[PDB]
Amino acid sequence: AAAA
Amino acid sequence: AAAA
Amino acid sequence: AAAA
Amino acid sequence: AAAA
Amino acid sequence: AAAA
Amino acid sequence: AAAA
Amino acid sequence: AAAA
Amino acid sequence: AAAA
Amino acid sequence: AAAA
Amino acid sequence: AAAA
Amino acid sequence: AAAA
Amino acid sequence: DIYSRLLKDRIVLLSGEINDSVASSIVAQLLFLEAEDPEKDIGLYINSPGGVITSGLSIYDTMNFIRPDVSTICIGQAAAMGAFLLSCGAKGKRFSLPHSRIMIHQPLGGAQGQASDIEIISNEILRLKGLMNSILAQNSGQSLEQIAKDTDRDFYMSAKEAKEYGLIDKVLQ
Amino acid sequence: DIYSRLLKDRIVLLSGEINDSVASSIVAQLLFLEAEDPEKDIGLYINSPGGVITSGLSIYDTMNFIRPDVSTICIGQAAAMGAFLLSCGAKGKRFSLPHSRIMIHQPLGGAQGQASDIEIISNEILRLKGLMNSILAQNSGQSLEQIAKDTDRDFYMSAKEAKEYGLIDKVLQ
Amino acid sequence: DIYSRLLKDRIVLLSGEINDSVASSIVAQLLFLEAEDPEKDIGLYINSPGGVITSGLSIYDTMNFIRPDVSTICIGQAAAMGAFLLSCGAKGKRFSLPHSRIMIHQPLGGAQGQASDIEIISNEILRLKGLMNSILAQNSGQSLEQIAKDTDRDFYMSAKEAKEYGLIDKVLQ
Amino acid sequence: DIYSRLLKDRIVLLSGEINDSVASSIVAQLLFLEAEDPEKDIGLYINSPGGVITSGLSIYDTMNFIRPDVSTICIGQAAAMGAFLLSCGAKGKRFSLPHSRIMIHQPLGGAQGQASDIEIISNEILRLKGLMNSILAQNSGQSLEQIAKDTDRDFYMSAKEAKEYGLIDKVLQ
Amino acid sequence: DIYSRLLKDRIVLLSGEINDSVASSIVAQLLFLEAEDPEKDIGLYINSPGGVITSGLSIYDTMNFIRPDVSTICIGQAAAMGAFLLSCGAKGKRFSLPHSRIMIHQPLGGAQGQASDIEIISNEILRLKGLMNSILAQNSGQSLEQIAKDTDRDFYMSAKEAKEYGLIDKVLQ
Amino acid sequence: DIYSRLLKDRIVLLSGEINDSVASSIVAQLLFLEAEDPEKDIGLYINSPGGVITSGLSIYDTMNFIRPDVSTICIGQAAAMGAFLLSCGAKGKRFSLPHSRIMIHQPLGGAQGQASDIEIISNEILRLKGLMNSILAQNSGQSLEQIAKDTDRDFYMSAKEAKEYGLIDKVLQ
Amino acid sequence: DIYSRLLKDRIVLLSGEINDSVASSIVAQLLFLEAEDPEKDIGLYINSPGGVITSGLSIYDTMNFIRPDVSTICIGQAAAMGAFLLSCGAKGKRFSLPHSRIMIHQPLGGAQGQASDIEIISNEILRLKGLMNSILAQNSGQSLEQIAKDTDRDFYMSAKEAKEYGLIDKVLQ
Amino acid sequence: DIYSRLLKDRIVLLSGEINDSVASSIVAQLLFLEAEDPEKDIGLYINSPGGVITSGLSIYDTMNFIRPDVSTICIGQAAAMGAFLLSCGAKGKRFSLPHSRIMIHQPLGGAQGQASDIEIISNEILRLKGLMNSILAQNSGQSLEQIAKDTDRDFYMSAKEAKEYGLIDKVLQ
Amino acid sequence: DIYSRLLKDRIVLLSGEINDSVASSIVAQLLFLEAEDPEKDIGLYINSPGGVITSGLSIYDTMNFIRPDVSTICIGQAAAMGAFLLSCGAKGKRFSLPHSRIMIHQPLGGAQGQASDIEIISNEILRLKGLMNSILAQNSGQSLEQIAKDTDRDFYMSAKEAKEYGLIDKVLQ
Amino acid sequence: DIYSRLLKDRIVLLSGEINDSVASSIVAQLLFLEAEDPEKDIGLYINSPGGVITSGLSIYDTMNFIRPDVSTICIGQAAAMGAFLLSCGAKGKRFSLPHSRIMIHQPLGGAQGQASDIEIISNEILRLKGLMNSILAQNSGQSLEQIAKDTDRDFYMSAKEAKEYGLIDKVLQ
Amino acid sequence: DIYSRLLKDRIVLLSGEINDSVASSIVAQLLFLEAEDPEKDIGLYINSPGGVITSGLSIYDTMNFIRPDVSTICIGQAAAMGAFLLSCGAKGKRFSLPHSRIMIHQPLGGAQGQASDIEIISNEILRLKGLMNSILAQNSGQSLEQIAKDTDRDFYMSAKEAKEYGLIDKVLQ
């Protein structure tokens, strides 16, 4: 989900 | 929602 | 085309 | 349909 | 936005 | 189907 | 394309 | 058509 | 179109 | 791209 | 992604 | 407007699927008509395949809210929620034309999300199920037991049969 | 128009999803009635599944902004924002028809973007959560901790139960 | 028409997203009202999530083009460009209901094309950004530097806090 | 109808994209107006992002075709063909509100087909560019050559800059 | 109605693409104006990119089937069938505003199915092509071969060039 | 592979619609068998509903370009281009299983664009039409006129009738 | 490969719908097996819901074209064209597992275009209907009238019934 | 391939969402690895966000069905069902890399159809919730009550926390 | 693979539309054949409806770049870019089967954006048009004028015509 | 395989977006290479725009987990999670070619559902943001505060600037 | 596999648009060739329409990173990034076939989000622009200024002109  |  |  |  |  |  |  |  |  |  |  | 004209004769047509939009309309017409004359009877013609349960209940409660008797006449069909409303008409004034069909069944629905939410939603529909069954048992003379058994699956019947069952009082022929 | 005639009776109908369009319509109608007579009660019949929070609050604030008492009557259902508005009606004048269903729960929403923005949005929605729970406690007579525990997930109740709870004053049977 | 009636009382409603279509509508109403009475105040009720900047600027300029005082009243919400217009209301006549939320933030947009075009659009979005921050600063009594920092990201405020911030003059209790 | 009312006061609102249906309406209003009174001034308020060139040309020629002066007032923005039309207003009567943004740029379009059709279409758009660029030159005092360079890419400017540039006569700040 | 008003001034506006709907409207208007006053000139303002050939012929024949002289004025552009109609205008009453563009070209279309069918359609299209080139020749004073040569591919021209070519009589400069 | 083992026995299967893709494969296989032995016969099994003509001509020209006699066997069906290819098999070696169906018809296609382009395409489609009839007449012994008339529309046949017509030499009883 | 190792046992599997692609795959397998041994029997397992007719006929004529007997084994189901192929197995070697269902019915199709083409397609499909019924009759022992009647609509059968009908010889029960 | 080389070292990689095909891939490998040596340990590296419950349960049961010890190592993340499997690793051999995240939460799902069907599915999902909750306590040591309280909503924790909680035995470094 | 086998015989196949993907395959095979034996001839069989110009040019330049004579053989058809390439084969070794259809025409394309870009693309598309016409003139022996006239629109011809035109050397009987 | 041979010289390539599929592959390659020789250095070339955070962490922990020193070389670009990984290389062996671009920025994500869930998801993303910024600080030598400040928005830097920042050790000039 | 055998001859093919996937492949091949023989020349054939900048920069730096000279050969076309790569080949070894087209232009892109993010992406793209213009300046021997002027918009050139310009060192006749 979370991404950079 | 609920239906008849 | 025709099929069975 | 033909057009111009 | 937020809904209830 | 039921998921986790 | 033309076909038969 | 040409637009601006 | 720039929005706020 | 241009074609012929 | 910038392209050239 | 054709409908506005018939409305002037206290005739209200409930046609199509029942939902909040249709419900608010039928409700406004009901309230309007009792504002016009709280004594005169109202003719609620019904041709519906059913719909949203709470939407139906708002119409049902309004029917008993106002003073006029709300006579019900089934034309085409009155299925599920539509059949519910038909049976809610004033006692002795629930009608149906010769070839209308009446069908009753338990609630349909859906639930998604966490197991917790799905259980809360499930219980709520079961609550509405029992509420329908009970008011149906009351309007027809059948026992809760018969209703529960008969509405487990689609229960279709002609106007005559619907008369024998108790959903309506007479078949206007 | 049918609703136009009912409006002359100071009757307003809030039906379906609550958003800015619907909110403006209701706001506009309350302002109108205020101008037509700042003394007589107004009847706000509610049959809503809920909706946008800022939208619902404008209605709420408008109800207390105008002079007349805004009576609320739940028909069909009053869920979430719909139930919120119901509870906001003039004290002693919050009603519900016998088979209406009332439901309350916390805010739902979404946030996308950078961690920084997601947090900000999260904070604001939690702010709206605390705001409503607070008012819900004040309107019902329940404690903030009780409201908070009960609105954690969907909390469905019957009209009679909503009265017991404090959301409404009387079930018109 | 409910809105046309309220317009007769010099009440204008800006609800929903702000765009050229909506702007022309609010411009026509402002110009119309001045024609009716260039002295009488005008009440601009605002419930908007924001919208297109140039469109918003067209309303702001018209507000100061006509002779009447355009009072602003925030109900529900005044976000971004909506908050901007709220702040632009006639001095001392910028109001809000107690539960309205107000939010300000920097411009948003998109740039597509050659490096040269993106740069040109970028500088243009920046110019619009400095312009809004400049007026927002003058309207609130905040320094330009402070407004730039606070609008960097979504900055939400209650009615009380927006009043203390300087965006409005009074919270109608 | 709010707009029909402003028309009675000789006010024409051109808001949004420019195209044949829009141009058709604008031209229709101008013809109607001068027929109404061929000597009184006309106010063409412009808030547009641009559009079809030939559509804009129909408005421009009609503006000069009819006897009465057509004053142009920029509100929000006048971009590309919008900036073109604004500049076409009767000399001395071209205005803009203080925070409007004006922009000019060369024509945009497309060509599909054989190499021969493409060169044909290409020459025609180059013709329109030169046609538009020349009238822009005549209207602002700029040289044809300068306009061509300035409109090579999006050229945005403020109301004041637009005045100093020659597109409008004065700013009603 | 803006268009009903101009129609009272015997003004007809053919805007946008030509098809049966548009042709039916234009034709109906011409019959009406003749029945109104078979002696007074009719002003047909043309701003069209072209359209269906038979539809356009429909307008062409009606223009010559009624007794009134049908004057045509080109505003914006008269391309293809649009230019055809502009040239069918009455003797010496075919005008154009100074910055309009005129374009003529051979017919476009499609054919599918058996070889025998494609041939039949192909021939009917060549038929329409010859019919139109011949009428353009007649209306302009150009030889048939010249028109066939010039319309082989898109042929754009200014209002002035259009006069010299013979498609219009004067340019309302 | 299964098809590879069969190819080893100089058996080639043409199944499905004929297009450049299918044609390159068949042509590729035919050139292969030739290199392996230019004298040993080849068995081209055909079960196709037809397809692109030029693609079919590539197969046909190749069959006669190579030294080996290419026998043709129709299983399932050989329609349009399929029947064509089947009849192009080496004389005396054109076969069909007992329950196959053979169909012949004129070319089918499409054309879009300017009258000139459609005309050119139509003529080329007719050229291909005349080209195939000539060959069909040659391979079957029938007259050009007879082929031209019989293929005007779908002409279905049983294996025995195809034989009696001249399209094949024998039916494997 | 699994299916391949089975092919080494002279086992071929016809699974899923029948079309040119599949028929090509099945015919290639029968030819291969004949190439490997033209005396040993071949086992064709069938579990098909049916498919294209000319496609099924190719497999059918192939089963008889090659020297080795083609025994058919129905598993799961053999519907329509599937049941046909099943019945076409070498006499005395048409089998079915105990719980397979067999179903036969008249052909299905479609036609578009001119009335002439639609009639041509109707007769052809009728020809294919008469052709399969007679062959079906030859295979079962039923009269052409019986097959005609039973296949008017879907006719399902258990393995046992299909045996008694003559479509298969034995049920490997 | 690479994954195949690692399997030789008895390393099984569970990457991505958990469904049936993925479940059968992991089960096949665990069975395979036991066939190679029912004595040596197996390394099941887990980086999964969760998935189908019955799918995940087949992997768990298989882990305890074979004699070799299946050690779990969390890399990246082990969420929900992923966390379940991680905790099911052989005692003393459940590991995690230093920056992995572990999350546990109740099941999610959907239900459609009649009230009776929704109830059955809801109960089956509550059953699965109780199964996982109890097995999760057994694997960690926490009381069933504490697991239920912690899995009501997403419970995220770092490697260290996961160890303190009892889901894993040691955090590598 | 059968295509690999043919490549062993120095037989390359170009089938279908020409694009970069297709060109790179052909170019790669040409370079491979030269590395295999820079003296033996190569056979480039062509069946193509045309494609991307720069893609074709790369195949053409590679044909003259390597040492081997690249003979060209047209099967099915060689159109536009396909014909162009066909004509580029080693002099005296450009062939075609008898029923192939050759066709040449001017480039086709599309431009979109600012007038400035449309012009750049149009000039570039014209550069290619002239470059191909000049190369076609050199390849066939005809004058640039003749090629320009003949390629204005689709120009179809038979192998015999194409040979007489100069596009190929001989037609294989 | 070109990649397989490069892996033999201990070179793994990380190109494109980072996710569970890519990560499990990079992990497998790293584990493999350690098994091959746990003492020799590994060259991890990076050209990535970034990706899923937990995924990149699995790669990271696998890098420290294994005995071999994993050198990182940035080619093309190392953005966000891609840059994070470039800095996680063995001290003194974090390289970059002269024209690569490095970028670091805070996490991006999404949250949906009840306020409770949003706050949980927001907290977790903020947790991942802290973890990422922390490691970035430790790897570069910058303070925690500096990293948080510079990653608030996209922070682009040339290879030499990334060296001065502490992200890499040397730029292969 | 043709491409692999060509790789043995030190031939690398870059065809199609440039993106990370194609770039990693190209880089992988270049690193492979150096590992095979860091002494011999590599021939990089380029037929590309351009692509992702950083993707192209990865290839450019690898070419200079490895020891062997990387000769570039343009076939068909080298546009934008493709032309950039072409000009980056080892001095004296930058080639082109006679009919290739070389085109150079400034970068293209998109920006979306807050004004601050658009400014960041705008500066970054301009950074990429300045970078490539000066490398192209040094690769051709011209002033950055004249390059910037030339790449403002698409700049097409014949192979000969590309040589005159300084992008390639020779045109292979």
From Swiss-Prot, chains L, M, N, O, P, Q, R, S, T, U, V:
Its EC number is 3.4.21.92. The keyword Coiled coil does not apply. InterPro entries: ClpP, ClpP/crotonase-like_dom_sf, ClpP/TepA, ClpP_His_AS, ClpP_Ser_AS. One of its GO terms (molecular function) is ATPase binding. It is found in: Cytoplasm. Keywords: Cytoplasm, Hydrolase, Protease, Serine protease. Coiled coil: none annotated. Pfam families: CLP_protease (PF00574). The keyword Glycosyltransferase does not apply. It catalyses: Hydrolysis of proteins to small peptides in the presence of ATP and magnesium. alpha-casein is the usual test substrate. In the absence of ATP, only oligopeptides shorter than five residues are hydrolyzed (such as succinyl-Leu-Tyr-|-NHMec, and Leu-Tyr-Leu-|-Tyr-Trp, in which cleavage of the -Tyr-|-Leu- and -Tyr-|-Trp bonds also occurs). One of its GO terms (cellular component) is cytoplasm. GO terms for biological process: protein quality control for misfolded or incompletely synthesized proteins. The active site is at A80 (nucleophile), H105. Fourteen ClpP subunits assemble into 2 heptameric rings which stack back to back to give a disk-like structure with a central cavity, resembling the structure of eukaryotic proteasomes. Cleaves peptides in various proteins in a process that requires ATP hydrolysis. Has a chymotrypsin-like activity. Plays a major role in the degradation of misfolded proteins. Belongs to the peptidase S14 family. PANTHER family: ATP-DEPENDENT CLP PROTEASE PROTEOLYTIC SUBUNIT. This is ATP-dependent Clp protease proteolytic subunit. It comes from Helicobacter pylori (strain ATCC 700392 / 26695).
